[PDB]
């Protein structure tokens, strides 16, 4: 029960499954796209712990169109060495600081397949975050949600 417009947008965001997370570069085109699918996703500003823990624990790279885990630095070097991203920490730095090769780094990362949040959601999950729900922008509270889904 998704309108076709939202379905296309979440396809561009690669959010093809519930509880799937991705990193996005926040700009005009992203800001308004997130506005359209705002009832269907929640987004916020991740801190360094959130980014580092996502890539270490749930980090998988798209290599030869395959979901290869980020188990060794050679995997990242072989796939992102053209942009001088040699290790996991370099990949974290590129994502966190939004470097020049953010698009290549983010697209290399497979969308994160988060679990259900330990402790549950709010009682009515499909209301806006401001209105006591969980949908929409939630600023730095995306961190607390992520530690629930890790």
């Amino acid at each position: 029960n998704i309108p076709p417009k939202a379905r296309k947008i979440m396809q561009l965001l690669r959010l093809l499954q519930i509880n799937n997370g991705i990193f996005v570069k926040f700009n005009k085109a992203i800001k308004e796209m997130l506005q359209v699918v705002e009832p269907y996703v929640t987004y916020g500003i991740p801190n360094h712990k959130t980014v580092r823990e996502l890539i270490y624990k749930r980090g998988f790279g798209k290599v030869n169109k395959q979901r290869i885990p980020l188990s060794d630095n050679a995997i990242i070097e072989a796939a992102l060495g053209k942009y001088s991203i040699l290790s996991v920490e370099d990949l974290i730095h590129e994502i966190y600081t939004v470097g020049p090769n953010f698009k290549q780094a983010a697209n290399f990362l497979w969308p994160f397949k988060l679990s259900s949040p330990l402790g549950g959601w709010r009682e009515r999950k499909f209301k806006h975050f401001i209105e006591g729900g969980d949908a929409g922008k939630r600023d730095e509270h995306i961190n607390g949600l992520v530690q629930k889904m890790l």
Binding site: F129, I130, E131, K137, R138, D139, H141
Partner: protein, 168 residues
């Protein structure tokens, strides 16, 4: 758990208004995200300032300066009802401005079944002089010899052996 937030904001500088006026509001919300949303709502409905054209320049939680001093707080609110246009004034006795607002929200949702979004707090003031108190139940609280037996006492371990004392 509500929190009192000082939110100061203004429209983005432009050639027509290189020094925009900074507007401040003391408003209550569970978190900063809700407070900044409520601030934008009030600013739009008063000054017609668009959210996109504006920006939040400061957000600060305000703790109670004297949380251990019992006070009386008078709150003016714009009650939204079936007709959607009503003004009310209420007085609550407690030690924190946040607590009085929390009691205000619970009371209004209880008596008048008014939601958080329908209610908008207009002003909260601390009535320090006993004489300006307008409520009889509050005045009975400020009497010097206030003393009363405890009401609504009521008190797994099912199957108690004896009967409850439910007294002194």
């Amino acid at each position: 758990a509500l929190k009192e937030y000082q939110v100061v904001g203004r429209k983005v500088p432009t050639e027509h208004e290189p020094v925009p006026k900074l507007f401040r509001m003391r408003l209550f919300a569970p978190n900063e995200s809700v407070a900044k949303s409520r601030y934008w709502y009030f600013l739009k409905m008063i000054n017609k300032v668009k959210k996109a054209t504006g920006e939040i320049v400061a957000i600060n939680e305000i703790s109670e300066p004297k949380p251990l001093k019992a006070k009386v707080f008078g709150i003016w609110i714009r009650y939204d009802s079936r007709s959607g246009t009503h003004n009310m004034y209420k007085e609550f006795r407690d030690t924190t401005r946040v607590g009085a607002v929390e009691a205000m929200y619970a009371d209004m949702a209880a008596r008048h079944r008014a939601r958080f979004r329908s209610i908008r707090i207009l002003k909260v003031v601390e009535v320090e002089k006993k004489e300006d108190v307008r409520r009889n139940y509050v005045k009975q609280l400020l009497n010097p010899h206030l003393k009363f037996p405890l009401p609504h006492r009521r008190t797994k371990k099912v199957f108690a052996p004896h009967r409850p004392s439910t007294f002194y």
